[PDB]
Every structure is written in structure tokens, then in C-alpha cells.
Symmetry: C5
Subunit: 395 residues, 5 copies
Amino acid sequence: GEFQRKLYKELVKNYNPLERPVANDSQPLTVYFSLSLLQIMDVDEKNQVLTTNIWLQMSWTDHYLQWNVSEYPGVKTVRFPDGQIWKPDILLYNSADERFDATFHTNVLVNSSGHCQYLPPGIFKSSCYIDVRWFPFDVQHCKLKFGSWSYGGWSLDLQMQEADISGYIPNGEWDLVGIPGKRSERFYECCKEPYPDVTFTVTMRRRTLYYGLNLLIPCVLISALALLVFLLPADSGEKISLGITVLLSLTVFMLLVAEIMPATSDSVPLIAQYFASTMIIVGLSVVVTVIVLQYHHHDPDGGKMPKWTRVILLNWCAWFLRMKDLAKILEEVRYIANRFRCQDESEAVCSEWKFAACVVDRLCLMAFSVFTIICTIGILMSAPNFVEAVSKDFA
Amino acid sequence: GEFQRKLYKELVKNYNPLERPVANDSQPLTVYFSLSLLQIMDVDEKNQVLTTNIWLQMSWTDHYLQWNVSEYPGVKTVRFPDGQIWKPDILLYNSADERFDATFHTNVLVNSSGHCQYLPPGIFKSSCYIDVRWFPFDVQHCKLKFGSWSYGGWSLDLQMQEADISGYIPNGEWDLVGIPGKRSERFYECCKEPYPDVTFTVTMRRRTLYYGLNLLIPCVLISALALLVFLLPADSGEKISLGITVLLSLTVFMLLVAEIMPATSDSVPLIAQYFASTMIIVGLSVVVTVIVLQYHHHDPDGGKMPKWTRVILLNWCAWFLRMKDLAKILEEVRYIANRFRCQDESEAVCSEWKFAACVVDRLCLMAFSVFTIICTIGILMSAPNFVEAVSKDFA
Amino acid sequence: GEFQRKLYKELVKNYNPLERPVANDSQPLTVYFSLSLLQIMDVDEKNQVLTTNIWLQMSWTDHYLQWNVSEYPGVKTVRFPDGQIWKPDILLYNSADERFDATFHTNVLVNSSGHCQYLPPGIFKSSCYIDVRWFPFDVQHCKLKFGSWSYGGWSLDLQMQEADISGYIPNGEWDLVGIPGKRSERFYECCKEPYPDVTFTVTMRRRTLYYGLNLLIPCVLISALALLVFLLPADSGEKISLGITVLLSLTVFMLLVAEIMPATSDSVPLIAQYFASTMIIVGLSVVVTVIVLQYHHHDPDGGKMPKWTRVILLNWCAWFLRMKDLAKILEEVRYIANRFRCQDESEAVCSEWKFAACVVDRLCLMAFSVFTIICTIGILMSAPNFVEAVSKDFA
Amino acid sequence: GEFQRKLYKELVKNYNPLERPVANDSQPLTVYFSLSLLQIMDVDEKNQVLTTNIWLQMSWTDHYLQWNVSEYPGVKTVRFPDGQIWKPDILLYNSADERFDATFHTNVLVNSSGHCQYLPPGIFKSSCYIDVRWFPFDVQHCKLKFGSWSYGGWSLDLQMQEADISGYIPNGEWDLVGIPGKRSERFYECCKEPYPDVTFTVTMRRRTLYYGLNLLIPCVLISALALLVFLLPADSGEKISLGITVLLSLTVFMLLVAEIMPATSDSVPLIAQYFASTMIIVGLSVVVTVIVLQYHHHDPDGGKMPKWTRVILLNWCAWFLRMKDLAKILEEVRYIANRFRCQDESEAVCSEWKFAACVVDRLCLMAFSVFTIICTIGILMSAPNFVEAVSKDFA
Amino acid sequence: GEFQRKLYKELVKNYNPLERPVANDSQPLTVYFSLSLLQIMDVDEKNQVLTTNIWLQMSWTDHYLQWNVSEYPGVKTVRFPDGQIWKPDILLYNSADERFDATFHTNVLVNSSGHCQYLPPGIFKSSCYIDVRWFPFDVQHCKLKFGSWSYGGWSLDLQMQEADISGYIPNGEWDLVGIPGKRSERFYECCKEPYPDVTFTVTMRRRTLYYGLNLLIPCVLISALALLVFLLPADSGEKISLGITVLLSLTVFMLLVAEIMPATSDSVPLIAQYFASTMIIVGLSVVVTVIVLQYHHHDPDGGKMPKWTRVILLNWCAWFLRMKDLAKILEEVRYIANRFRCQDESEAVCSEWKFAACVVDRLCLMAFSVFTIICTIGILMSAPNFVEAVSKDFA
Ligand SMILES: *[C@@H]1O[C@H](CO)[C@@H](O[C@@H]2O[C@H](CO)[C@@H](O)[C@H](O)[C@H]2NC(C)=O)[C@H](O)[C@H]1NC(C)=O
Ligand SMILES: *[C@@H]1O[C@H](CO)[C@@H](O[C@@H]2O[C@H](CO)[C@@H](O)[C@H](O)[C@H]2NC(C)=O)[C@H](O)[C@H]1NC(C)=O
Ligand SMILES: *[C@@H]1O[C@H](CO)[C@@H](O)[C@H](O)[C@H]1NC(C)=O
């Protein structure tokens, strides 16, 4: 138009984009700063970073960009691109990014009274420490610290406004708890002036539905599958063909677990020690079934059945469980009969040994069950906010 | 040439690329906006993004770029690069991109009446929520929301035109259903002026041919392979050498399944619960086998054959199935005969127990089949648009 | 030098890099366009793109860049950087690239008569549809479509020249067949002027040596390894310990196959159905060997040997195969003799059943071999250009 | 303001950003250089690089940027962007980076006396040699070498200041030991002037908690699980059903080990030879078992029991271990008796052979245990700072 | 300073950065070119590229940048940034890079006589053909071809200088052999003037320590572990439980081999055919075992022991190996005796068949050993520079 052309020609005359737009040079310039969170992109525990989508919001006042609306009855606001007017240098301090800015400087909008507003959108990669002591049941607090790079507290004083969580697009893996802000001042013992900054604390909680279905339940159908070796009669020629195949079927289960657990060496995750306990129990279940077949396959005429074995394994532990010419012909037939009687005696001795083996089997069955139940309950229930997680997530 | 040189010199004289090219400054500038979809590149459920190839199209009118064709009889159109003439600032709102623009501003073509046309091509990464409750049979709706960053409804009013699906280059994994557009206005209670925007809704459907061939059929040849353990006589020493090898051969099958299923914890996918049901059925098929070999390997002189076991397992359930000197020599020979008779009696008792075991085997065979059939049919048929998917994809 | 300094000062005087360098403004400017292919980098079937290394070549004539060599006896050619003289705006149309250009604008060389030559090198990512119906034996045709963005046919008319395949650096995975070009004109019913474009069609063929050695022969040593279960006597207690281990040894073979096959759901690849046939045959080989051990382990006094079973399995199918006081002592000894005779009769019945089982085993052996041979030959030989591929690749 | 506007207009008048801001051109310009480490991002042994987060700090003095505060009572400091004033050209020498700079040049702050301070933040990818001879127990020293690209020692002399490790954000995988600095001068035999440079040496130590729990303990529960094959009686038909399944269950354990061990061919890592020893011991445990069942399954009438075998295996090694008409009837019965006696003699011979086999089994059991214990202790304890690592990490 | 300010103001007066800085325009400008290799980053055989770290070095003379040191007694050298003075346009020809330059143009240093030096550092991605016929024992020659883009031999003649291998930082995977250079001229039949270029040939050798320890030895302990099946008596019910588990334990070994071997289809690597031979031998070892148990489990009264089988398998091949009223009572007892004699005859026939089986077992054992030894030695020793590789690498 005819009027905005001359307005734009007049506004930028004798304008310096390097000076602070204040009328006295001794008074601070109040800048209002706010943030808007759009979505949480990633939380990386390897490099300890947090990738989020954020729109900043900055507002201030300019003194050399004022005009009278009556003289220009067609224009009420103007817009200036990057590098033509003064803008605050507020930027993220952590900024664990390659280019360190990720801001995409957009246009700046100015009213007829000089009130300037500037909001750039971006994807921010902050650096926060991640604690993974309780890997599945985890709650994290990360920080975003904003401030001016080269302005003091008597030139550019930051002010804080509440964030905006409208339109959050929930992640589906991390449950956002909150994001409060706080403004702080840091004095230095050379200047006696403040250096304000504004920090926002994102607090979030991990969802434990995928891990409780794809990791836990699979490994409780295998830990309890080993115990069947204590209910299988030893007469069948397959007692380690089942005991050693459950261990191999679970060793291949750790190939899809190692792609989930973290690689940090600071602490031992809860799921790691749970899986270690399952490993140890399944491995130790195979040791016992070798001390049972030694009892079952004992030589009839190569042992003595020690008295202690007969008392412990047949009287005490078996009552708790509630188990319970003519002369030559005569000589030849007598020989055959004696042979048969000797075989019968050997069979009786073998039967005693087999009963001892069965008693051992039931004794070993009765204890591994309580062991695995106690371990499974205690390891999982030791973590805090476990009841909170199972109430919010499953139910 | 001689004429276009002076035309280009004259057009850019006293021209400001910051002002809106209108003749009154109080009338809106109508801008026509349209879109062209070239292909769908990716749909990422981890970060919940959608990558597509799109050519935007913008058209408007300029007032300071008008000339008379009679005075310049050689030129009818002109072209201006980026940064030399005014262009609308319409841009995507979601834009879950690092650089946030992905536009590649090309040249602007101007006719002899000022009608300007500008179409930049690009690859756009929008952010839309993805629901994966029914993972294989899935239908998704995503949105692309375009508007002006810093212009109101009384300065730059958007207008909508239909999209263009010519030359779509079908993806081969997602079946496009449609892409309709809609224009909306959003009033604010400080200005009483509209802020129009234009949104296009891409609706697409997932193709279920790869999943039905590479995932389902493999796991129906293994779920039905376990049932053979109920048709194998127990005399052979292989009843757990087959029962436990099918479970291990399916545990290694979940290594190529975990690379397909999503990792979202918001809901339980249909394929996940189907695979869990298969897991549970195959695991429980091994528990029953141990309770069959206990019947087969029973001690002849260590039990009593309870009456209930004899009635249920041999009378009722067995009829539904339609199973059905001289003195010493004499004494020695009599001893041998009595021994043989005792062995015969023991063999008869063992035979009764083996028949009971066979009856149990057939009873257990008759039920697991209906269990697996019911589960397989019901889980898959519960999803909506299942008939539509199988009609469009397979047939 | 003294002369080229004044030449450069004189050439760029009153020069506009925005106008078309023609002497009448009504005559077209002929631009000669050609291409040079350096190597094929990648062919991605997921996003359906083709990445290649290409040097374009453009030539035209300029009217304002002419000088007399006699006046400047030291200079014959000049060079201008990007942004100082007019260049054609020919670019790839498909250009499924993030930055959409990938051109690296180099210097422009000008002779003493204005003849300008300009060749930029780059890596181009085109978008072409990939058909994978016959995955190993595959032939692909992709297109590269070049043209001017904003110039008609009466201002900048494209001309075509043959490509240059010298220095091709063969890929080692794709065998290049050819690359012919074609020029086309597209009229529009608003202007009645042509809009020429130039398209080059790269035709290539896949090499099938890696797949035929690392995927096929592996799975013919396992498909034929299962059949040995039909040559193993049933007396040994290992018949399912071999049948079920070949299936598990091939289920783990699909872990290194799933990383090669494509994920497209448009059609079923040939190798996919070949592997499915191998899976089905190996799985069905285990069903039969359970109906053989049922015949071998039959109870002597629990069946009747149906007449049909005796005729089919022992007369017809067995001839095709070419298989083929004193009283008490007397009473006791007579009892023992009768016992022995009964045992002999039972053994004879068992022997008959075992012979029936062996006949079944040979009958089942004779058919699976022809099944697998027919499937293996027919599935592979059904693809076209199979003889061409095996002649060019292996021999 | 009114005053800083004229100050900025006056400072940049007749200013050249190419000249060194010194007052005599023959005196050196002292530049103070310091570094601040924020966190360690990665240590890559494949390409031998180290990625860290670092803020440099540079300070110097300018002569043309001095003003009087009394004349401008409102301003005390000024700020200049990149490309408007002179800055030192100190950069990292190693800089194994694509863009080689990674600096993000920020603003430069100037006091009222010309003292300039400039600190750019960035992510630096240095190139240092990594020694992995002792892979788990590893200590690394990497270098960062800074200096001026094109300034001598008589123009820009570097000065060193101590680093700053405040706010380190510990990595959780590498334990930082220290980072001392050193300044050096390098004369050349053409100029006789120094060329100073400043080098910082980051010394760090690897944490060995993850490797000692997820790699070692798993493989000590499998190496010791094979030895059970020497405590399992040979009467049960499972002795290579356990010996060969432990080897297969640990062959699948090397799939999750190969993703951790380095691929360098310069030296043999300690964990590699430890795993090789476990491979060899477990594989050799199966060879012995075959030489035990040959003794157990010896033919009664097909051998002689050599004298050496009887002395070594039954006298010496068995005492260390502390093992320990009427005529025809008469003829027929005598025949039966003789048959029985022959069978008894054969059984006695078989019993002798089985005892020899058991002695061999115990002899082989007693040695593999000490072998594996010695190997496990010696291989791990040979590395230096092993006690230091286990004291700092585990306890 | 006062003097360098006026020197900088005077040098750039009337200076054109587009002209060649020569004093006659008819004489060539000699440019000295050299290279410095810092480290080898990668050698990729998929896309056939080579990534290295290189500092170029260029030197020439300028005519308009000369001054008298007496008039400016404080300055001896000057520095100019990119884009202010003339620089040669030498660049890499292959340059299989996205941006095609990777140069990072630094400052240019000029002495008081005009002698200019310019050395940019960078990471270069060249394109060279990689031959992988002998994958472990491999020697590669790649080329780097430098030259001027648009200057002839009568304007800018290249000169060559030796490279600099000081500070090489050895890779640890590729052993550098050398890097010699060569300068060449290429005439064209339109101009009759040379077009010189400079090429450096990097020759390197692969280190074979990782492959010889992590791939070969693992697959030698498994190839020789199968042969134990020929030393295991058939009485034990484990002869296929060991033969088929070694094949499955080696099928899972190809999962960590497929991540190492190349995917090129141009030629078959040596390691590929070695692994194929191991596969074939291990698979064929199981076929023979089935033909041994057919001999051992032969029916006593279902065969005839063909004469050829008795001569070959028991006379010739067994000598090479050095194997070696009263009437009824009488009738009943006679019946029992006859039964016993028949059983004895059947047992004798079975014993003959078992001896034949043992002879077959030893005959098969004696040949597979020489087969595997010959294959293993011949395949590895066929490659050239094998002795050189094992001498430099292992010893
Ligand atoms: C401008 O700021 C600089 C900051 O370095 C001041 O230099 C330091 O000033 C303090 C104050 O006395 C001294 O203790 C230090 O020794 C100074 N540093 C050096 C390297 O000398 C400088 O004095 C300030 N100038 C004015 C006029 O305030
Ligand atoms: C400016 O520096 C250049 C650096 O190359 C000097 O050129 C070399 O000078 C040495 C000193 O005598 C000679 O030995 C070399 O032969 C020169 N190089 C060449 C390629 O000729 C140059 O002399 C210096 N000029 C002044 C005035 O000091
Ligand atoms: C600027 O502020 C100071 C106090 O902060 C005041 O003394 C001075 O008068 C102000 N400037 C003007 C021009 O009034």
C-alpha cells in the first residue's frame, strides 16, 4: 500500500540492530519468557539426553518502533525478519546438541505501541542424569535451564510465566507427571549484581504394561516348567532330556532380553537381579536330579545303605510326606531254585533304593516351589510405587 | 534482450519485499492454497510421525508487478528468486521436523497482470497419534494443518482447493483411502477477527498379506504339531523329547516376532494376545503329558487303584470314546510255578494301569483341539473390518 | 594480468543475471542437455528409491559475453561463479530427496564467442516403483525425468544427447542392461505451446549368485536330511529325536532368511513360497512317522488286524516294493511249557505288526522324494529369464 | 538509548576485522586459553574417536575498542557478533570431524578498557588411539591439542590456565581420572621462532560391573554344569544328551557376546582368551565321555582286559580314590544248568568292565575341576589394576 | 597497528578475485600440490567407498600482493579469508560424497614476496573398486585423483610433491603398505594442449588375526567333534542324539558368520567355500550313521548275509584294520531245551551282524578324517600371500 510503504521506510531509518531498545540506558528491560511443551520425543539413557518438542515465547517492549495510527489509518502491526531488529539472546544452557541452538528464528511481530512478541519453535535435546536403579518402575526428573548469554540483571531481567501443556499428544511410553518452573538469581563476588535464570522441571513416570506382559509372564511359564522334573517318574528314560532343555530354552530367551535392559554400570537394575535369580534357580534344579538318579541306579551289591540315610530318608522325611539217577536231577533243580531266590533278594534291595529316590524327589519338589514364589514376590514388591504403577497401568 | 532488461530494471525500482502488495491496506489479500500428494514415505509409531512427499501450491495477485504488453512486445511472464518479492508465510503447524520448514523455496512466476503462482516441493514430517490396538487390521487418520504464522483474517484470508492424487505411486504397505480438506476459523476474545486455517486428513489402511503369511501360518504348523504328542504310544522313549522340542522351536520363533510387534504400552495388540494364547496352550500341553506317564509307569505293588479312578477313567469316559527223593524235586518245581504265577498277576495289574493311561491320553487329545480352534478363530475374528481386509487383500 | 582485469571489469558492466540472454526476446534459446552415469549406489525397496552418481551436462550460447580476441591477446576463456550469470533451471522432477537439488553448482566456463558449458556433479535419489514378484530373478526399469521448472517451449527448448556409460565401476550386485533417453512434449489446453522434457530409463538386472549359494543349497541339505527318518530302523529309540531336530534346525535357519526377503505386501515372492513349501514338507514328514510307531508298538492282545489293512499293506503294496508223586511234577512242567507257547504266539503277532510298519515306512519314503523334487524343480523353473540368469551368473 | 547508539556508531568507524589489534605491530598479543569439560559422550574403538562436550574460553585485549565511561554514563560493556571484530583462530588440531570446527561462534563481550572475552560451546570429536589388550580392566589416555592455525610465537603467544571439572555429569560407564594440561613450543629450522600449543590429557578408567555380572557369572554356571556329566551313572540312557546340550546352550551364548567384544586385530583381549578357554574345556569334556562308555559297553567275549589296564585302573588309581528214561531228563536239566552258569560268568566279566569305567569316570572328574579353577583364576588375575577395579566397582 | 591497517587498505584496492594472478596472461602459473594422510577411517565394500582423513597442501605465487618491508617495518606476512583472493580450483574427481567437496576452506597466508600457501584439512570419501575373492587374505589398491576443474595446461600446470606419512595413527584393521604418487597429462584432439592431473595410490593389506581366532578355531572344534560319532558304541541309545546336535550347534554358528561375510555376488570368497565344505562334511557324516544302525538292528530271520557283504566287510576290510508217566515229562523238558538252542542260534546270527556294523564304523572313521584334513589344509593354503600374512600377523 501507499501508507505501509512509507511506514516501513521511516521505521528502519537510523536504526541499529545492535543496541538495547531502551530510553535511558540505565534502566533494565523486562522480558517475559514462557514455554510450551508439544510432545516428548525420546529419553536416551546411553548418552543421557532428552529430546522434546518445545515452542518458546518471548515478549518485550521497543521504543524506536512506535507510530501514530491516525497518520497511517491502514496499518496496526508490522513484521520484521531475522537480523533487522534487536532480539534477546535467551538460550538453553544444557543444549547437548550438535548445533547448540535448534531454534528456527521466525519473524517478529510489533504492535503500534512497540510491544514485540517472538515465539520460535524447535526440537530441544537437553542433558539430564537418568537413574535406572528400578528399571521397570522408574520416575525421572529432568531440567531445562534458560537464560541470557551476555546480559546482566541490570540490563535484561528475566521474568517467568507458567508453561502450557494444552495439546500434549501423550507419548504412550512415558506418563507425564508435571512441569513446574522457577526463577533464580546468582550473585558473583566481583560485580554485586544478579544474573537471573528460569528453570523448568519435567517430571515423568514410566509405563510398565509392555514389560509386565512381554518379559515377566514368559519367564514365569519357564521357571515353573522346570519343577515338572520332580513329578516325572525316573523309569522313563527322559529326566535330563527335560531338565536340560528348559535351561537351553531360557538361554535363548536372554537374547530378546539383552535388547531391552540398560547397559549402565552405575547400579544393578531390579529386572537384572530378578532374571539372575531365575537363571540360578533353573540351573540349580538340574544339579538335584543327578543326585536322584544316583539313588535310583544304585548297584544291588555295591553299597550298604548307611544308617543315617535309612533314618532320615525313610522314617522321618517319609512320614511328614505321607508316602508309605535222581540225585543229579535234584541237585540241578535245587541250583535253579537258589538262583531264583538270589535274584529275588537283589530285586528287593533295588526296590528299597528306588523308594529312597522317590522320597528325595518329593522332598526336593516341596522346597523349590516356596523358593521361587518367595523370590518372585519379594524382588518385584521391593520397589517403591509398585502398587501405584500396577493400579494406574494394569487396572 | 533489450526490452526485458529495462522491464526488470523498472519493476524492482522502489520495491519493498516487506509490505503486503495491496492497493488500500484495509482490504484482505485472497491467497488460494492447494496440495499435491506424491507418495507416502513412512509411518513411525515409535516417535508417532508421518513422512510424506508433498508439493504445495499457492496463488495470489500482486499490484506493483503490472506492465503493458504492447510496450514490451517480447515478454509475457517474469520470474523472481527468493527474497526479492513478497510471499505468504503459510507453513505447517505440526512440523515435527528438525529444521521445521522442509520447503526448498523455488522461483516465483508472475504474469503480465500481476497474478503470482508459487509451488515449492518438499518432504514433510507431520506428527499424528497412531492407534495400534488392532495391529494387523489397522486404519489410521492423520492430519496436516496449514496456516499463516503472523497474519490475521482481515489481512491474509486463506482459501481452499481440492487436493490432487494423480501420480500417487502406491506404497505397497499402506492402502490409501482418502484425503479430504476443510477450512476453519478460530476467533479470539481480544480481537474479534477470524484466523483461518486449512486442514487435510489423510486416511489410510494397512495391508495384511505379509503378516498373514510370514507370521500366522508358521505358528499354526507348530501349535498343531504339539497335539501329536497325544497320538504317540508311551512305549517309545520319546514323549517329552517331542513335547519339549516344540516349545523350544517356538521360543526361537519369538525372536523374529519381537522385531515386528510395536513397543507401545498404551494397549494390548491383537497379535500379542494371540501369540500369548499360543504360548500358554503349547506350555500347558507339556504339563498333561507328565500326568500320563505317571499312570503308565505305576508300580504294580505300590498302589490300590481308587474306586473313583476306576469308574471315571474306565467305565464312563471309556464308553464315550469307544475304546474297549521225589518230594524235594516236586517242591522246587512247585516253587518255580508259583513264581511264574505271581509274575503273571503283576503283569495284569500293570496292563490295567496302562489302559487307564491310554484313556487319559485320548481324553486330553479330544479337548486341546477344540481349545486351540476356538481361540484361533475367536481372537482373529473379533477385530472389525476383518472380512473387508481379507476380501481386499487375499482374494 | 593487465588485459583480463579490464575484460572482467567490462563484461559484468550493466549485466542482469535475471534475464534470458537472447537477442530478440521472441526466439527460443536452445539448450543441449546430456547425462553421465558414474555408478549405481543403492536400490531401496522399502521407500522405493534409487541412489546413483550422475554428472549432468548443459550447453548453451550467451549474447552479452562476447569479446574480440585481438584486443585481448592473452585470454580465450573466462569463468564465472554461481550467482553472477544466467543459468538454466533444469532439475529432476522425481527427486525424492530432502534438499531436492543435490547439484553442487560449480563454475561456468565461457569461450570467446559466448558458448557456455556447465556440468555439475551430484548424487541423485530418484523415486521409481520396484516390482519384487520374482525376488531372486528380477529385472528393474527406473526413470529419471529432467525438465525446466518455469520456462515454456517458446523460451527454453530442451535438446537431447546420448548418455555416457564410460567409467561405470560395475556395482557387483546389479547388472546394468542399458540406459536410453527420449524427449517428449506435453501440450496444455490453455496455451497451445509445448513443454519439452527429457527422460532416461535405466534398465538393470539382479545377480543371483549369492542367493543361490548362501540360501538355496543350505536348505536342500536340510530338506533332504529329513527323509533319512524313513531309512532308520524303529528298534533304535531315536526316530523323533531326528525328525523333530531337523525342523528346529530349520526354524533357526529362518532367522538369517528374514533379513534378506522384502517386506512388501503387494505380491508373494518366489523364494517366499519356495521356503513355505520346504516348511510344509518338513513339518508333514513328522506327522507320518507317528503313524508308523503306532503300528510298531501295537499291543499283541488289543487289536484284530483288519482285513483291509492285511490286504493293502501286506499283499499289494508289499509286492510292488519286493519286500518279502509224578502227576504234580508233570502238571507243573506242562504249565511251564504252555506259558512258553503262549509267549511264542504273542511274539509272532507282534512280528506281523512290525512288518506292516516297515511296509508303511517304505511306502512313505517312496513319495516324499518325488514330492520334494517336483516342488523344488517347478517353483524355481517357473520364473522367466531363469535360464538366462543361470547362464550369465554361474557359468 | 541515545548514548550507546553513538558509541556503537563511533567504535566501528574505520575498523578493519582483518588486522591484529595491537599498538606496535612488533609486540606479541597475549591470549589466555582455558577449557571446561561438561560430559563425556562416547569413546568409539572402531574409528578410534572420542566425543565430548566442551566449552572453550578465550580472553585477550583490544586497543581500538576503548572509550571513556564519563562521556557515556549509561554503558559499561558492548557486544559484537561474528565477523565484526578480530578474534583469535585457535582450533583443535586432531578434529576428526566432518565439518572440522563444531564451535558455534557466539557473541564477543568487551569491557570499557578493551578486555575481550569469548567462550564458544561445542561437541568435539577428537582422534586418539585406544588400546584394548585388557578389555574389561581398561585405562585410557586421550589428548586434545589446541593451537593457532596461522600465527607464530612473536604475534600470538598462547597462555594456559587450569581446566574446570565442575558440573561433570558422570558418564556411568567411564570413570574419569583426570585432565591435566601442558603448554609446549616447537621450533623450526627456518625461522628460529616458537610456535606454542596447549594440550589437555583426559585420563579415564572403565567400569567393570556390567561385564562381571552379565557376562562372567552366566558362563561360570555353564562351565561348571558340564562337570555333572561325571557324576551321572551310565546306566541311565542320558550321558551325551547332557554333555552335548551344554555345548549347544553355550554356543548360543556367544551370540550375545559377539555384540560386546571389540573387532580390533592388533591384540587378543583378555575376555576373548577366557571365553576361548571355556570353549576348549567344555568341548574336551565331551571327548572323555565317549572313552567311558566304550569301557561300560564292552563285549563280554571280545576282549582280554590287558594287564596294564588292570593294574593302573583297578589297583593304583582305585586305591587313591577309596572306591572298592531218566538219562535224557538228566541230560536236559544239566544242559539248562550249564547254560545258566555260562551266563553268570559273562555277567561277572561285564561287572569288572563297568567297575573300570566308574574308576575312569572319577579320575576324569577329579582333574577337570582343578583345570577350570586354575584357568578361571589365572586368566582374570593376570590383568593389572584388577584389585583396584574390584575394590572401586563392586565393594 | 598503524602500518598493517594501511597495508591491508592498500593491498585490496582495485583487486579482482576472479582473475589469474599472473603478469603476462600468456604464461602458465605453477602450482605445487601435495597431500598428507592422517588416518584411514573406513573401507566399505557395499557401496565401494573409502573414507580417509587428509590434509591437502597447495602453494603458488601472487603478483599483486607484494610490498616493501622497509616501508612497513612491523609486518612480514598477511592472511586473507575465503572469497577475498584468488585460489586454485583443484578438487578430487572421484569424490563419492553428498556435498562433493569436504574441504573446509581455511585462511590463506601470504609472505612479503607474494608466495601464497593454502592447506585445507578434510575427510575424503573416494570411490574405488574392492576385490574380495580372497576375503581374509586381501590386498587392496585405491586411487585418489586430483586436478583442476576448468583450467588447462597452459594456464595452471600442476606439479607433484611426495606425500607425508608422518603421524599415521595405525588403523588396527588394515595394514598400510604404501602411497606413491604420479603425474599424468591427457591430450584432446580439439585443442592440442595438456591437462595434467596428480594421482596417489593407497595400497593396503588386511590383518587376519581376528578372523583366524574368532571364526576358524570355533569351526574346527565342531567339525572334528562330529567324528566322535564313529567312536561311540551303538549299544547306547545316543548315536543320532549326538550326530544331529552337532549339525544344529553349527547351524546356529552361521548366525554370527553372516554378519561378517560380504554380500557381493561377483565372486565366491574363500571363507564361504571353506564354510560350505564344513557344512557338507558335517551333514554327510549323519547319512553314514543311519547305514550303520541298519546293520546293527537287523532281524535275525529276515535276511541272508549276501556273499559279497561277507567277503568285503569281514575278510578284506576286517584284516586291514586288525579287528578280529515219564514220557510227557521228557517231552516237555526236551521242548524247553530246543527253545533255548533256537534262541542261542538267533543270538549268534545277531552277533555276526553287529560285528559287520562295527567294521563299517571303523572303515567310515578312517576316511572322514583324511577328507576333513585335506579340505582344511588345501582351501586355506590355496590363497596367495598366506605365508606372508601368517608370518606378519600371528608370529
Ligand atoms: C574490564 O573487565 C576486565 C575483565 O577481565 C577487567 O580486567 C580485570 O579487572 C580486575 C579488576 O581489578 C583485575 O583484578 C584483573 O586482574 C583484570 N584482569 C586482567 C587480565 O588484567 C578490567 O579491569 C575491566 N576494566 C574496567 C575499566 O573496569
Ligand atoms: C616468503 O616465503 C616463501 C615461502 O615459500 C619463501 O620462498 C622460499 O624461500 C626460501 C628462503 O630462501 C627458499 O630457500 C625457497 O626456495 C623459497 N621457495 C620457493 C618455492 O622458491 C620466500 O623467499 C619468502 N620471501 C621473503 C621476501 O622472505
Ligand atoms: C536514568 O535513570 C537514572 C536513575 O536510574 C536517572 O538519574 C536519570 O535521570 C535517568 N535519565 C534521564 C535522561 O532522565
